[PDB]
Enzyme design. Structure first.
Site, PDB file in Angstrom:
ATOM      1  NE  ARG A   1      -6.064  -2.363  -1.236  1.00  0.00           N
ATOM      2  CZ  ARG A   1      -6.078  -3.503  -0.533  1.00  0.00           C
ATOM      3  NH1 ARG A   1      -5.212  -4.240  -0.059  1.00  0.00           N
ATOM      4  NH2 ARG A   1      -7.127  -4.260  -0.383  1.00  0.00           N
TER       5      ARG A   1
ATOM      6  CG  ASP B   1       4.481  -2.358  -8.899  1.00  0.00           C
ATOM      7  OD1 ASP B   1       5.021  -3.147  -8.093  1.00  0.00           O
ATOM      8  OD2 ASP B   1       3.487  -1.503  -8.661  1.00  0.00           O
TER       9      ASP B   1
ATOM     10  CD  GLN C   1      -1.007  -9.740  -3.179  1.00  0.00           C
ATOM     11  OE1 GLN C   1      -1.521 -10.874  -2.925  1.00  0.00           O
ATOM     12  NE2 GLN C   1      -1.932  -8.782  -3.590  1.00  0.00           N
TER      13      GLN C   1
ATOM     14  CD  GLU D   1      -3.387  -0.731   1.574  1.00  0.00           C
ATOM     15  OE1 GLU D   1      -3.914   0.463   1.037  1.00  0.00           O
ATOM     16  OE2 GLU D   1      -4.250  -1.434   2.158  1.00  0.00           O
TER      17      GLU D   1
END
Ligand code: GDP
EC number: 3.6.5.-
Length: 315
Positions: free
Chosen positions: A146, A168, A172, A11
């Site tokens: 998100r 990117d 996770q 985040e």
């Protein structure tokens, strides 16, 4: 051809930054791509008002008018109604009653306790706009969503007679993120930091606070042999969130040893120095930092242009 590797915690905004490259140098998000994000904007709003609801439960909060109790029930009944971007107006009215009620708002100022999407107050206020059947997400709406980043995300654009490939990593999972393959080489690293994360609240299993974990991640990323002549660009992001947060919650939360005062500028330079002091590397390897609000297309544009002038100066 320039290689930008995008590294940050969770985040931290990386998908927001990629979405910004597609806006700024590519053609941007057409209406069709907005229409796809319809369901994302919806389910973000739903999971968020749900989040605050459930957290009224464990923080011991009551509804300002107890009339909202059944409103809560009805939420979970129609929570999936917005599966297919169909927000019924019943669902809308429920979310409005709930967000407008006092106790919900009290749990929401407590926010930092129960963990809830950064773009919550956004959609939740602008709910009237969103709840139109024919609503199309504004570009800022797509930037606010998100979606959690699966494998390795790629972006190709051109800028100032230069081709750029951005990656990117996401992954996770902090060890699934390992991918030292991409690590080898690389024009420039963009480490992203969720400033607003200082005051977050330690989980049971959690050893340090989020901010500190990110600092360790940065310390290993910079002081890496693979990135010796890699240009290291730190975005101290969500400056807007962090700017709002300093008023209510002291920076003493994250760093206890901080004897400076709880003002935007002192705390921001202190976090800056905290991160920058992790570099044991040369004077040839001087980290370049900027304070950033990644949902601000213009702010990003200007930052990234100064960044490119840096990267050029290295070649
Ligand atoms: N309000 C606000 N939201 C931000 C900012 N930067 C990133 N975000 C939001 O932070 C959330 C997490 O960003 P995300 O793109 O998922 O970052 P990621 O975890 O690195 O993939 C998203 O909803 C973005 O909309 C900011 O400066 N201000």
């Amino acid at each position: 051809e320039v290689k930008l590797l995008l590294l940050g915690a969770g985040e931290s905004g990386k998908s927001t930054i990629v979405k910004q490259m597609k806006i700024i140098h590519e053609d941007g998000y057409s209406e069709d791509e907005c229409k796809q994000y319809k369901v994302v904007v919806y389910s973000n709003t739903i999971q968020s008002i749900i989040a605050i609801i459930r957290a009224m439960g464990r923080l011991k909060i009551d509804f300002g008018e107890a009339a909202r109790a059944d409103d809560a029930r009805q939420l979970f009944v129609l929570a999936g109604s917005a599966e297919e971007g169909v927000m019924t107006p019943e669902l809308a009215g429920v979310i409005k009653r709930l967000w407008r009620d006092g106790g919900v708002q009290a749990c929401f100022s407590r926010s930092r306790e129960y963990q809830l999407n950064d773009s919550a107050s956004y959609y939740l206020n602008d709910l009237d706009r969103i709840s139109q059947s024919n609503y199309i997400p504004t570009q800022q709406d797509v930037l606010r969503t998100r979606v959690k980043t699966t494998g390795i995300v790629e972006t190709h654009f051109t800028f100032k007679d230069l081709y750029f490939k951005m990656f990117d990593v996401g992954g996770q999972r902090s060890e699934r993120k390992k991918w030292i393959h991409c690590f080898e080489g690389v024009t420039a690293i963009i480490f992203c930091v969720a400033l607003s994360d200082y005051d977050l609240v330690l989980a049971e299993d959690e050893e340090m606070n989020r901010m500190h974990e990110s600092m360790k991640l940065f310390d290993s990323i910079c002081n890496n042999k693979w990135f010796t002549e890699t240009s290291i660009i730190l975005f101290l992001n969500k400056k807007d969130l962090f700017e709002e947060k300093i008023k209510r919650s002291p920076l003493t939360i994250c760093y206890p040893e901080y004897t400076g005062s709880n003002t935007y500028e002192e705390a921001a330079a202190y976090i800056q120095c905290q991160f920058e002091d992790l570099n044991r590397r040369k004077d040839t390897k001087e980290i370049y930092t900027h304070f950033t609000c990644a949902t601000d297309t213009k702010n990003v544009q200007f930052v990234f242009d100064a960044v490119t002038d840096v990267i050029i100066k290295n070649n």
